[PDB]
mmCIF file with all atom_site columns, N, CA, C and O in Angstrom:
data_model
loop_
_atom_site.group_PDB
_atom_site.id
_atom_site.type_symbol
_atom_site.label_atom_id
_atom_site.label_alt_id
_atom_site.label_comp_id
_atom_site.label_asym_id
_atom_site.label_entity_id
_atom_site.label_seq_id
_atom_site.pdbx_PDB_ins_code
_atom_site.Cartn_x
_atom_site.Cartn_y
_atom_site.Cartn_z
_atom_site.occupancy
_atom_site.B_iso_or_equiv
_atom_site.pdbx_formal_charge
_atom_site.auth_seq_id
_atom_site.auth_comp_id
_atom_site.auth_asym_id
_atom_site.auth_atom_id
_atom_site.pdbx_PDB_model_num
ATOM 1  N N  . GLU A 1 1  ? 16.570 24.009 -10.327 1.00 20.53 ? 1  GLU A N  1
ATOM 2  C CA . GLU A 1 1  ? 17.447 23.651 -11.540 1.00 20.53 ? 1  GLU A CA 1
ATOM 3  C C  . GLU A 1 1  ? 18.856 23.456 -10.848 1.00 20.53 ? 1  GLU A C  1
ATOM 4  O O  . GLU A 1 1  ? 19.280 24.244 -9.653  1.00 20.53 ? 1  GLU A O  1
ATOM 5  N N  . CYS A 1 2  ? 19.635 22.715 -11.915 1.00 17.62 ? 2  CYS A N  1
ATOM 6  C CA . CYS A 1 2  ? 21.261 22.656 -11.550 1.00 17.62 ? 2  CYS A CA 1
ATOM 7  C C  . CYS A 1 2  ? 21.551 22.362 -12.732 1.00 17.62 ? 2  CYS A C  1
ATOM 8  O O  . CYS A 1 2  ? 21.721 20.663 -12.531 1.00 17.62 ? 2  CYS A O  1
ATOM 9  N N  . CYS A 1 3  ? 21.912 22.377 -13.437 1.00 20.01 ? 3  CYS A N  1
ATOM 10 C CA . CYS A 1 3  ? 23.029 22.610 -14.899 1.00 20.01 ? 3  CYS A CA 1
ATOM 11 C C  . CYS A 1 3  ? 23.967 22.409 -14.343 1.00 20.01 ? 3  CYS A C  1
ATOM 12 O O  . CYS A 1 3  ? 24.880 21.995 -15.851 1.00 20.01 ? 3  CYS A O  1
ATOM 13 N N  . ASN A 1 4  ? 24.324 23.371 -13.597 1.00 17.70 ? 4  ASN A N  1
ATOM 14 C CA . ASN A 1 4  ? 25.720 23.822 -13.323 1.00 17.70 ? 4  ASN A CA 1
ATOM 15 C C  . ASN A 1 4  ? 27.003 22.535 -12.982 1.00 17.70 ? 4  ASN A C  1
ATOM 16 O O  . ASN A 1 4  ? 26.342 21.616 -12.180 1.00 17.70 ? 4  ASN A O  1
ATOM 17 N N  . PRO A 1 5  ? 27.970 22.969 -12.958 1.00 16.47 ? 5  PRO A N  1
ATOM 18 C CA . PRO A 1 5  ? 28.993 21.792 -12.377 1.00 16.47 ? 5  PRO A CA 1
ATOM 19 C C  . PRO A 1 5  ? 29.192 21.798 -10.993 1.00 16.47 ? 5  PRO A C  1
ATOM 20 O O  . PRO A 1 5  ? 29.571 20.740 -10.331 1.00 16.47 ? 5  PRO A O  1
ATOM 21 N N  . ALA A 1 6  ? 29.167 23.262 -10.693 1.00 17.28 ? 6  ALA A N  1
ATOM 22 C CA . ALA A 1 6  ? 28.720 23.317 -9.352  1.00 17.28 ? 6  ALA A CA 1
ATOM 23 C C  . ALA A 1 6  ? 28.239 22.717 -8.351  1.00 17.28 ? 6  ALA A C  1
ATOM 24 O O  . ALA A 1 6  ? 28.679 21.671 -7.285  1.00 17.28 ? 6  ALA A O  1
ATOM 25 N N  . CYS A 1 7  ? 27.526 21.619 -9.112  1.00 18.74 ? 7  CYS A N  1
ATOM 26 C CA . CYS A 1 7  ? 26.532 20.589 -8.410  1.00 18.74 ? 7  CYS A CA 1
ATOM 27 C C  . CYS A 1 7  ? 27.759 19.747 -8.649  1.00 18.74 ? 7  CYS A C  1
ATOM 28 O O  . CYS A 1 7  ? 27.049 18.816 -7.108  1.00 18.74 ? 7  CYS A O  1
ATOM 29 N N  . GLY A 1 8  ? 28.265 19.356 -8.397  1.00 23.73 ? 8  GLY A N  1
ATOM 30 C CA . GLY A 1 8  ? 30.057 18.716 -8.410  1.00 23.73 ? 8  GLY A CA 1
ATOM 31 C C  . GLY A 1 8  ? 28.616 16.814 -8.238  1.00 23.73 ? 8  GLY A C  1
ATOM 32 O O  . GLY A 1 8  ? 28.455 16.613 -9.459  1.00 23.73 ? 8  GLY A O  1
ATOM 33 N N  . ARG A 1 9  ? 29.161 16.480 -6.970  1.00 24.21 ? 9  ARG A N  1
ATOM 34 C CA . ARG A 1 9  ? 28.311 14.956 -7.233  1.00 24.21 ? 9  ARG A CA 1
ATOM 35 C C  . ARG A 1 9  ? 27.201 15.489 -7.069  1.00 24.21 ? 9  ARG A C  1
ATOM 36 O O  . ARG A 1 9  ? 26.252 14.034 -7.036  1.00 24.21 ? 9  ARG A O  1
ATOM 37 N N  . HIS A 1 10 ? 26.622 16.218 -6.972  1.00 24.23 ? 10 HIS A N  1
ATOM 38 C CA . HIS A 1 10 ? 24.999 16.275 -6.689  1.00 24.23 ? 10 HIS A CA 1
ATOM 39 C C  . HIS A 1 10 ? 24.337 16.502 -8.136  1.00 24.23 ? 10 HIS A C  1
ATOM 40 O O  . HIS A 1 10 ? 23.424 17.504 -8.111  1.00 24.23 ? 10 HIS A O  1
ATOM 41 N N  . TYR A 1 11 ? 24.548 16.028 -8.607  1.00 26.41 ? 11 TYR A N  1
ATOM 42 C CA . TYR A 1 11 ? 24.681 16.380 -10.258 1.00 26.41 ? 11 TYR A CA 1
ATOM 43 C C  . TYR A 1 11 ? 22.733 16.581 -10.378 1.00 26.41 ? 11 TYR A C  1
ATOM 44 O O  . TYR A 1 11 ? 22.265 15.092 -9.839  1.00 26.41 ? 11 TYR A O  1
ATOM 45 N N  . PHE A 1 12 ? 21.766 16.711 -10.918 1.00 28.88 ? 12 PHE A N  1
ATOM 46 C CA . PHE A 1 12 ? 20.500 16.753 -11.357 1.00 28.88 ? 12 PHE A CA 1
ATOM 47 C C  . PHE A 1 12 ? 19.895 17.655 -12.399 1.00 28.88 ? 12 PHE A C  1
ATOM 48 O O  . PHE A 1 12 ? 19.939 18.931 -12.247 1.00 28.88 ? 12 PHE A O  1
ATOM 49 N N  . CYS A 1 13 ? 19.339 17.109 -13.291 1.00 29.36 ? 13 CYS A N  1
ATOM 50 C CA . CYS A 1 13 ? 18.996 17.973 -14.709 1.00 29.36 ? 13 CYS A CA 1
ATOM 51 C C  . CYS A 1 13 ? 18.442 17.407 -15.882 1.00 29.36 ? 13 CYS A C  1
ATOM 52 O O  . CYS A 1 13 ? 17.714 16.004 -15.291 1.00 29.36 ? 13 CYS A O  1
#
């Protein structure tokens, strides 16, 4: 999962 902002432009949730 990736709901954190650290995902930056790699957003996926």
